[model samples]
Target chain A: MSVERGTSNSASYKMFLTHGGSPISYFHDVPLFADATNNCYNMIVEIPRWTNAKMEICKEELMNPIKHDVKNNKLRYIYNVFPHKGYIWNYGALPQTWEDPSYVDEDTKAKGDNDPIDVCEIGSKIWPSGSVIPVKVLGILGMIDEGETDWKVIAINVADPMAEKLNDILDVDAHMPGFLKATRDWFKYYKVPAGKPENSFAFNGEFKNKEFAAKIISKTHEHWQKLISTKVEAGPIIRANVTVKGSPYMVSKEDFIDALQKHEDFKRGSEPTDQAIEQWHFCN
Target chain B: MSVERGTSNSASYKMFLTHGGSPISYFHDVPLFADATNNCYNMIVEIPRWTNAKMEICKEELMNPIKHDVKNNKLRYIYNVFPHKGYIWNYGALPQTWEDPSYVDEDTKAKGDNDPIDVCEIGSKIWPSGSVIPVKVLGILGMIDEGETDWKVIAINVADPMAEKLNDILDVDAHMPGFLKATRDWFKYYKVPAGKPENSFAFNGEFKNKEFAAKIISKTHEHWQKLISTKVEAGPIIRANVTVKGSPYMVSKEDFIDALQKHEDFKRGSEPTDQAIEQWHFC
Candidate 1:
């Protein structure tokens, strides 16, 4: 019952905006990220993090989410990533909640991967980055990444009337087998690049159902609170255990730069070239 | 061989674009709408014209094209209509082209629908209004409306690498049957709102292949020019059929006014409610 997002915008009206007051925020300014019932999830699309288009909507940047890179320990602006194959599904993350690096998780018996809970918005509409949607938990994918717990939530945009009848993972299998299978294929190779081992993470278990999603979300919520609390309960974590690509894996601040430099794709001071953004768009 | 549009932006490069340039246009100011070899058929996506979103990139004052509408005997602004269930593919049309209402179409056996040739760019990206992309001809849907031959050219975005190997309508069925049928559904019911019959039209026959698409496009290219020749063509068409709900049917100027007055959803001085646009966006 803790969702505050409005209906999907594309289906609700025909124009681009409300001329209303401040628009919703996915990263920075949202206070009500979930609903009171706690059965539904209010997710903010951070980045589709898919395809050629690296569409993003972090704090206030709505339609025009840009490419970001690290420099001087700050996220610097890069070009705007456009659509390559278009995202397989609308991708994003759950807000306010965090996967505290110190806590162990269900997906993996290891410590949690530090970041917001990730989600894939599976609805008919092509949702853009930064949209906050209310999603019905369908299932959960448990993946152990470099020995850390990283759970990816499978959800349907509850806002769409089309998904009104769905409540579980099996429903997805029945109604959209092709779509479900495509989602799996998307996750499996989104980072394969031209010649790399697939993404450094591995799906530790099979797709779990709604109840599993709820239990895990509940745990992450508590983990989120603990990370923000004054009491530093995480006494020690093996820095050696954190090494997945494309996430905020647990690492010492001193080692963060070293880890980043050693990794490929995302490195210190490297950003998308001006030409890259031009190439990303599909204009003739 | 007639294709002149530039390469697809995304496939050409792996990253996104610069802060940006002005967007493209669906209605005017485009040059490569159709070319010499007739291999390319630039088209503008009309609304699924049915069901829900009446999406059109007429104008938003954003891109190069700023084709407008009619209001009180005057030409108003052409607002780019976004938030459509996007075309079956990345679809849009040629600039500076027009289908004289006086001419007949292949689909309806009626007069020209008074719009540019329509196109569906089967690219991978969700193109914004006004953006232009060259598409590869696959097939054509010959829709006859109000006695005109309006054609819906089904083409793949040369920009979409996924469509790189596809060459015909059957290919669409094999690769994306859901998408193909959805496109038909979008067209069939996009205008089921009133007592007026579904757009007074019919698809002449079955979906034809690329060669057929190219032939029709070539004919329309000339049809587009002839319509522009007199400037007198569109003049009386202020008596022309400018419709919403769905399109290209013959609605006398007076009758057109009446339809607007009668339409509960669309009326004079009552353009799409300001709220429609606001809500149409995802921000």
Candidate 2:
């Protein structure tokens, strides 16, 4: 539930979980479920609402810290798209949940996006990047991005006011109204302004119910279990962590500290400040 | 292009047109083509952007004056869905264009909603109600509301900045990313909260291009011409006006003034100040 900032790359920053003031792997050490009985799951916020940085967990790196995505040596920023300012929701991913690329999904019939399961928190509060909070899943959008099954799990912080009333996707339509449709449209055309074609979706872009979403989360958790326990083709992810009793990649405390020291110390003024991040994009 | 406030009913306020300070009819006197050479049509603003009072041209009332609609003895206000305060765009209708209920549209295969062809001005400016402006049609959404074809003509003010860039529906998509989709979704669900089912659409809810929209508008204009000229059956509309030569229903200046005098004088305090008008109703 807590993380410390690591290496201070201008575009490739790192995040590592902290347990009792000791460095731990947020990817491997953090528990998948915050409250299993209530079906609440842990979520790592990568990009807060209204921000344009395409920050995400670096699955290829050691400890899988959050970093700004670089495309052709340039940092990525999403377009405003008129009514939408930036990332519409708190965009992030779930820990202990690997969307294994090799395995095809039963519903989407496409391979995973080779990353952790993504989440969009629709609550009122805007969480900061790297903050780990418990979220309750409401539904799921099976986005087929670049022919990959990139599922967007719709969720809300348990602390939100309407969390108690919203039990499923139907409640989202009844109470929030136009949100599900807007989310679908947001994802469909967000990349079009960047000279990319519209992203297609599985299930004809319809949102699946909460129970169905929970099953997807559970299955991805099982994928992560196989990923950590078997250590068979971790894909881009490096197998190294400071905790997790059964994980074959756990490193000693001295080794973890030594690895951290290899990267430059966290500094204050190494961030990108290009004007493109604040530019407005319009559409009818 | 100008209108005067007539009877000031709390739930049924009326609007009448005037030219040279004499009474006229917006339905019959206002020109449909503001600039027909450029395919620009005149639009009668009924409900401006953001505000929702369901004020529209009373096609069934005398002179087709714009009025705030009353439903079951109470004023109607649209629900404020998330991210959408009210009507997403400048909502109004085209002048001298009637969607004849008797005529069935070829695209939607449904009868018209028995009203003026509606328009949604997608310009950045928020227009005031009763303002008449020239607009160029961009596209059309054939919404089947309650078994009637309610064509929402997507248009833009001729004076808007992006109007020159947006010539058709594809330009609308290129220049305004999610506005078309949002408009579709907005109309599709705006009435669902009022104990109504989701509104269905023609062409599977897809928007048609500008040329196709212009054809629909032209057809509606022809229908309105027949409605005024024939006078066989005005339906809910009363065929009375101060202008339009050779029309049997044109009223004299004295009679028009007398008609206005029959209604109660306009009062500032007669407007409804109900809390529901200002209070936000969440979806």
Name the top TM-score candidate. 2
In the predicted model 2, the residue pairs found to clash are A283-B175, A283-B176, A283-B177, A284-B176, B60-B236
| Candidate 2 wrongly placed segments (more than 4 Å) | A1-81, A84-284, B1-9, B232-234, B237-242, B245-263, B270-283
**lDDT by residue for model 2 (A1-284), tens:** 44445334356456666667656566777787897647799998889876788888776666667787887887778886656657878999998888888899988899998788999998867689888989989999999999899999999899987899999999988987578988998898888778888899989999999999989988898888766764545343345443555433352321334434535455344644663343435533
What C-alpha lDDT, on a 0 to 100 scale, does residue A267 get in candidate 2? 39
The TM-score of predicted model 1 comes to: 0.50
For model 1 chain B, the run of ten residues with the poorest summed lDDT: B10-19
Per-residue accuracy of model 1 over B115-193 as CA lDDT, tens digit each? 6677766654555544445667888776665456666778766666766678788987776645555455445543342
Q: Tell me the lDDT of model 2 at A209.
A: 96
Candidate 1 to native Cα RMSD, angstroms: 13.7
Provide candidate 1's TM-score on chain A.
0.61
Q: Candidate 1 DockQ category?
A: incorrect
> Which number leads on lDDT?
2
Question: Model 2, B108: alpha-carbon shift in Å?
Answer: 2.5
lDDT against the true structure, each candidate = 0.47, 0.76
Q: How displaced is residue A164 in candidate 1, in Å?
A: 8.8
